[PDB]
């Protein structure tokens, strides 16, 4: 006969050997929970500090408040350190360039303190205004620094020699393997000069991302050629390229084969064409026979993106080549490839033959049909993610049959700007996975005229002036686990909304766990009237916790006064990021919003405004 136990002095969790407590804490990735854990008791504080694996530094590490923290503020196991978000956002961090002997020993001090809190860093992200930031910041970590990510949305300092931005890394950091320049504005010449003149450093590199703030027209054949040739050990390459054959230095069959031959070990390759404006059907210098040879040189390839404006024609044989020569291919994104799957009755062809595919994304395939979708559904039984963008011959019946046939497996769907697929009809088409779909991305196009049980994430595209409200009637009325929403507005102000009409943000109020919003109006264009239109009713999203807001775009992007007022009524916000500026003092947000913690003005677009002097 069991008796009920009373108040106990012992704590099972604290009575575990301390290593087992560290092991538990190592599984806790929510930062707010980790901070809360450290506040529970002294032992959990030790466990939290001993096991934190990543941190994004908040505040100004030049301030006494940071430098004169206790030695208890120590993270001995921390691998990834992100300094790119330190205040004030985008200012020079530990630069030698004066905004003379004081700046040097103040720089040395901050660095030493950072190395004191973060002894074990193997990956660093840093906002990098000029190379002396790197010179001051890497001596403490040069032995162990494996991945470096550079962030700069500002103009390249105009007096720097070619490649100077990357020199301090390439001279000093012998453990460097991974270089992420996706958000780093520099010239393509900088990358070429640095990477072809440092063979010691460059021969060891395995991962390279060359997005360069999405502000270049693309790497040329004469730039990509030498870069590849100097990096024989590349396993991952992400780069924008010039593909327009009106330019003689464009990337074509020769430049592609030369990349594969110089970097035979590639597993991840993502090439894209920077999009201006108006290229629709103009052909690329990439041919099907060229791609056959190309894929045959890349037997380890697993993840392939070739996102073009310029067209590659009759690509099915190249897809069959991909399946045969790259037996590990799993992740495939193609833009402006034509003839991807013809779908003859007796056999599977093209992309339908790639049986190992887990993700498939197709843009601007003009001859992709319902028949094509039938073959892909029969051939690609492992598809977890499916997307189509600007595929004007696919119908709701193609989607519906694909969704039904791939029911065991399909979790993420994108349908964007497909001519025959309006929103209501496309939502109905997804019926076979209504109770299974985790992520959905669609553009909203209305017709004037079962819960989504597992839908965690929603991304929506709109034209300027268009309303959100009809989304509820269109079929997304019940979404019990929907926690994040992304809204992006395209087009120009050539349609004024009727007076007293609003976008309809308050119509998301019936989603019980919607905590996160991305509202991107940067490409949407009196600016205050438009902000009123889009933001009105944001206050009624009761569980809204994190907001990313991009105001409309004049080189500064300022929130108007009604925009500030409507955001300031979001009483649940814990995190607020404005990608642009405000005339308002940042404290008015902290005072209006009782539990606001993380707020920052992140001007993460090129060119970022210079605000340097006090």
């Amino acid at each position: 006969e069991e008796v009920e136990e009373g108040r106990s002095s012992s704590s099972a969790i604290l009575d575990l050997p301390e290593p087992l407590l560290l092991h538990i804490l190592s599984f806790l990735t929510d930062v707010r929970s980790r901070h809360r854990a450290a506040l529970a008791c002294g032992r959990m504080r030790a466990a939290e500090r001993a096991t934190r694996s990543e941190l994004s530094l908040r505040g100004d590490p030049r301030s006494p408040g940071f430098l004169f923290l206790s030695h208890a503020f120590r993270f001995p196991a921390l691998e990834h350190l992100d300094l790119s978000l330190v205040s004030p956002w985008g200012h020079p961090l530990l630069s030698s360039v004066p905004p003379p002997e004081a700046i040097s020993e103040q720089n040395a001090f901050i660095a030493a303190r950072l190395a004191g809190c973060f002894p074990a860093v193997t990956s660093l992200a840093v906002y990098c205004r000029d190379p002396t930031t790197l010179a001051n910041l890497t001596p403490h970590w040069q032995a162990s620094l494996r991945r470096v990510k550079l962030v700069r949305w500002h103009q390249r300092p105009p007096t720097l020699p070619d490649g100077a931005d990357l020199e301090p890394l390439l001279e000093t950091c012998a453990a460097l393997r991974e270089l992420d320049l996706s958000e780093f504005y520099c010239w393509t010449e900088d990358v070429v000069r640095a990477l072809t003149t440092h063979p010691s450093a460059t021969a060891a590199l395995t991962h390279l991302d060359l997005g360069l703030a999405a502000a270049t027209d693309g790497f040329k054949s004469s730039e990509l050629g030498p870069i590849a040739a100097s990096c024989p050990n590349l396993r991952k390459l992400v780069a924008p390229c010039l593909f327009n054959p009106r330019f003689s230095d464009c990337v074509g069959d020769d430049a592609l084969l030369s990349l594969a031959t110089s970097c035979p070990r590639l597993t991840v390759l993502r090439l894209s064409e920077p999009f201006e404006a108006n290229i629709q059907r103009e052909e690329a210098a990439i041919t099907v026979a060229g791609l056959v040879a190309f894929f045959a040189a890349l037997p380890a390839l697993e993840d392939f993106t070739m996102d073009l404006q310029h067209n590659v024609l009759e690509a099915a044989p190249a897809m069959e080549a991909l399946a045969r020569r790259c037996p590990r291919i799993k992740f495939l994104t193609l833009g402006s490839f034509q003839g991807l799957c013809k779908a003859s009755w007796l056999h599977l062809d093209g992309v339908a033959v790639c049986g190992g595919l887990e993700s498939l994304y197709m843009k601007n395939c003009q001859d992709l049909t319902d028949a094509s979708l039938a073959a892909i559904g029969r051939g690609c039984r492992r598809l977890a993610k499916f997307g189509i963008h600007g595929c004007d011959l696919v119908t709701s019946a193609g989607i519906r049959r694909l969704a039904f046939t791939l029911r065991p497996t399909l979790k993420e769907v994108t349908v964007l700007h497909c001519r025959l697929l309006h929103t209501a009809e496309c939502l109905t088409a997804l019926s076979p996975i209504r109770d299974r779909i985790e992520s959905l991305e669609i553009n909203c196009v209305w017709n004037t005229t079962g819960s989504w049980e597992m839908l965690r994430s929603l991304s929506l595209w709109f034209s300027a002036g268009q309303l959100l409200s009809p989304l509820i009637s269109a079929g997304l009325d019940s979404c019990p686990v929907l926690e994040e929403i992304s809204i992006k507005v395209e087009g120009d102000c050539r349609t004024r909304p009727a007076p007293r009409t609003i976008f309809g943000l308050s119509d998301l109020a019936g989603f019980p766990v919607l905590a996160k919003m991305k509202l991107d109006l940067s490409e949407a264009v009196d600016l205050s009237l438009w902000e009123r239109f889009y933001l009105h009713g944001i206050e009624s999203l009761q569980t809204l916790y994190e907001l990313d807001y991009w105001p409309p775009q004049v080189h500064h992007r300022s929130l108007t006064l009604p925009a500030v007022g409507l955001i300031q009524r979001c009483v649940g916000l814990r995190k607020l990021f404005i990608h642009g500026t405000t005339h308002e003092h940042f404290m008015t947000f902290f005072l209006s919003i009782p539990n606001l913690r993380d707020m920052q003005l992140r001007e993460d677009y090129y060119p970022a405004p210079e605000n340097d002097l006090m």
Binding site: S8, S11, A12, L14, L28, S33, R36, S70
Partner: protein, 117 residues
């Protein structure tokens, strides 16, 4: 395999301490350990719907018997219990006394301020 009390099969290579007595794991906990190892074959969240006390005994057993996979799931569960809770609710759940002075507590808050959430 012997209990603390007094139970044998071929799945036993899953425990690396084994690779016949086990004096530190009780009969109730050994029955559950074997149950987890049987299921992990060639052809889980439910198994983890147990009380807090049994959970902590299972962590202890998984460590002792050196079952990497069992220790991971069992410890991941505890981490999920910590998530989303105030410091007082963490304390309540796990029966922790607050050993901090108010000044130490303020130091912890001031330090936490240096990371983004």
């Amino acid at each position: 395999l012997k209990s603390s009390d007094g139970v044998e099969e071929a799945v036993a290579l899953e425990s690396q301490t084994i690779a016949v007595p086990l004096p530190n794991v009780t009969s109730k906990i050994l029955a559950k350990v074997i149950e987890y190892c049987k299921r992990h074959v060639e052809a889980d969240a439910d198994f983890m719907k147990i009380d807090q006390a049994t959970l902590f005994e299972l962590i202890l057993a998984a460590n002792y018997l050196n079952i990497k996979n069992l220790l991971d799931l069992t410890c991941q569960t505890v981490a999920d219990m910590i998530k989303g809770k105030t410091p007082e609710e963490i304390r309540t759940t796990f029966n922790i006394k607050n050993d901090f002075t108010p000044e130490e507590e303020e130091e912890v808050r001031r330090e936490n301020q240096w990371a983004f959430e």
